[PDB]
Automatic annotation (TrEMBL):
GO terms for molecular function: aminoacyl-tRNA deacylase activity. It holds the Pfam family HDOD. InterPro entries: HDOD, RNase_Y/CdgJ, UCP036888_HDGYP-like, YbaK/aa-tRNA-synt-asso_dom_sf, YbaK/aa-tRNA-synth-assoc-dom. This is HDOD domain-containing protein. SUPFAM superfamilies: HD-domain/PDEase-like, YbaK/ProRS associated domain.
Amino acid sequence: DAPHAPQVILQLLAKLGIACREVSDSAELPAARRVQAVLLDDAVGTLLVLFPQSQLLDLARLTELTGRKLLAIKPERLERMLGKHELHRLPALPPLTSSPCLYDERLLQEPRLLIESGQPGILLEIASNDFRGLLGKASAARFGEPLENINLNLDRPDDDRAEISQAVQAFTARRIQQRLEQTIEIPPLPQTAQKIIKLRVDPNASVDDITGLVETDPALAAQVVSWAASPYYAAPGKIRSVEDAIVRVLGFDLVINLALGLALGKSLSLPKDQPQQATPYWQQAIYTAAVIEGLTRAMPRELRPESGLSYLGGLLHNFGYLVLAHVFPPHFSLICRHLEVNPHLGHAYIEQHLLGITREQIGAWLMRVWDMPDDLYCALRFQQDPSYTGPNAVYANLICLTNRLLRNSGIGDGTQQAIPAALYERLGITPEKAGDAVKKVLEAEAALRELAAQFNR
């Protein structure tokens, strides 16, 4: 019934004379008490690195300290070593491996450390002085970058244009033009999407106007019928025309915005590289969109935003990821290598440390040069800040609650994250009602995956 720590680990700690009590995993636990363990390798062999989750592992500084160019081991290599002791996580116990161990000294500052039990959701609380006894044959160093030194820009949009220009000059190696748009290599943006943007601002746009415009791009039109044909939205086999799908299944408000998202999706190619065993891009896009739809439906009528525009935010919340792969291809693979060695961290901290900007910053900036609706600009720019209460906050707050809830289920990047009580109250959703919608969506997740498998070409 109740999960417990593995017998082989509890048996080992008793043999080594280390006291330990089980502790359930929670986002409320302070980061500095949580010891993260990663396995790194190169030509020479494996290296075990331990550091508090209060800092990010910087592979550049690791090579400066050790001289080795270390990278995350292949998951097959990890699963074999975790399988040796029947573990599904990596506890920070050097006895488990023959590999040399390196640890940041600052790890020991907190009296009560928390290591992974190897059974997910269960942590071990170990006294720091007892833990030191495992590090007698290890190397001690100071190499993590404390998160308190990394300043995310969630509060100063006015500096966005400046800080992007700063990153572009340092990494792009492209000529600076009086204007940031000129300096960057901007794809033109497809005409199909350009036409849809102008159609959105017509108060009296009609189903005939969009059905005709969607039919100018048969490739896009085929996706819309396939979207309405999906078992998620519809029942077995009524397909007929795009007009049938708009009027019978999807509705006008959704399809005008769904077509806008699908049209922007072809404007940038998918990155050639990705973090290993990452959630595929369109699954993360579709899952986030479908959950906003159910969460919007559970919202009080006084606070429900436009249902279709909220859906566009879920489709495009990760769009800056596509921008960063295009503008800084060498750093993008460097971002991937660092996400693989910082499982406890969301992407946002890594991007600020390596480039000086976040993907949310650059994706929102690209939305407004394309004259996308300002609702969508606010949604992308502030999706990582649950405390945002500025204009159009309800769109951005929806993305924050959806991705955070997706992470607890598993989909997404980083570790499980805290959801402030203020966010649930501002949307008028109870955590049980919000979880109820998300659980009911994940039961139908199988239909969502096939909708994101057409999108591999």
